[PDB]
Design a protein around this ligand. Structure first.
Ligand code: GNP
Ligand code: MG
Length: 253
């Protein structure tokens, strides 16, 4: 039972922190280093082997042309691996799946229109993998700002024809419309540090004006994202990956 999630997005958006938050919500609090290479972190949780693929952020160069190619390369490498092991010569009953089933795309909360780089990046990934749009560091927005920006992001994904998951043509539609039009993009806060609020140990960030709680729906939507990818839509993510994306890959070969 393998499930593989990738995080991608501009450097400094809290991708690695959210990776740790995902695992920890499911005992030291050391500083998280800037990510230099693509690394697959796997832990066993019925029993599910959850692997999260951390990636070096992009967009930190003067010229960011073709910066998506390392990510595309990794994704295609897992397809090629699965393709080659499908021919189960070893006669194994179960075949290991390292294919990216889900890609969280981190969007910086600028309050303005989506950046051409992100639009191009998402356009590329959307045709090879399931992408889920996430607004990073949601604590940097007020309530009013966040509502406006979520609406703006939805509109701009729509006008640019970015087919993020759940792709409309794969539906349930009552639940999904709620997802595409209300739940997404998930505005998240990450932290693998714990604090005490009203007696409860909670994952959060401690500011001079208050404590931001990661799993508190009054503060952010990390809980909704986690539930979505780990519980309610996990099998569906795997199904679209195998039957649509991987088959698209297989045919292109
Ligand atoms: N305000 C805020 N800061 C956050 C949040 N998550 C992480 N940070 C902080 O943002 C900084 C960068 O986090 P990091 O997880 O390393 O980002 P990254 O996207 O992995 N960077 P890279 O792609 O270079 O490896 C750290 O100081 C971290 O504590 C968040 O939700 N809100
Ligand atoms: Mg990182």
């Amino acid at each position: 039972f393998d499930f593989n999630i990738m995080v991608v997005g501009q450097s400094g958006l809290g991708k690695s922190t959210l990776v740790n938050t995902l695992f920890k919500s499911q005992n030291r609090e050391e500083k998280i280093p800037k990510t230099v290479e693509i690394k697959a972190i796997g832990h066993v949780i019925v029993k599910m082997k959850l692997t999260v693929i951390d990636t070096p952020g992009f967009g930190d160069q003067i010229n960011n042309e073709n910066c998506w190619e390392p990510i595309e390369k990794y994704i295609n490498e897992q397809y090629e691996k699965f393709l080659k092991e499908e021919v189960n010569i070893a006669r194994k009953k179960r075949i290991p799946d390292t294919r990216v089933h889900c890609c969280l795309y981190f969007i910086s909360p600028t309050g303005h229109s989506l950046r051409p780089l992100d639009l191009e990046f998402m356009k590329h990934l959307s045709k090879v993998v399931n992408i889920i749009p996430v607004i990073a560091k949601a604590d940097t927005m007020t309530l009013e700002e966040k509502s406006e920006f979520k609406q703006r992001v939805r509109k701009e994904l729509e006008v640019n024809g970015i087919e993020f998951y759940p792709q409309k043509e794969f539906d349930d539609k009552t639940e999904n419309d709620k997802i595409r039009q209300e739940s997404m993009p998930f505005a998240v806060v990450g932290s693998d540090k714990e604090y005490q609020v009203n007696g409860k140990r909670v994952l959060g960030r401690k500011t001079p004006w208050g404590i931001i709680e990661v799993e508190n729906l009054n503060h952010c939507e990390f809980a909704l994202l986690r539930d979505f990818v780990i519980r309610t839509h996990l099998q569906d993510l795997k199904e679209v990956t195998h039957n649509i994306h991987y088959e698209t890959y297989r045919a292109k070969r």
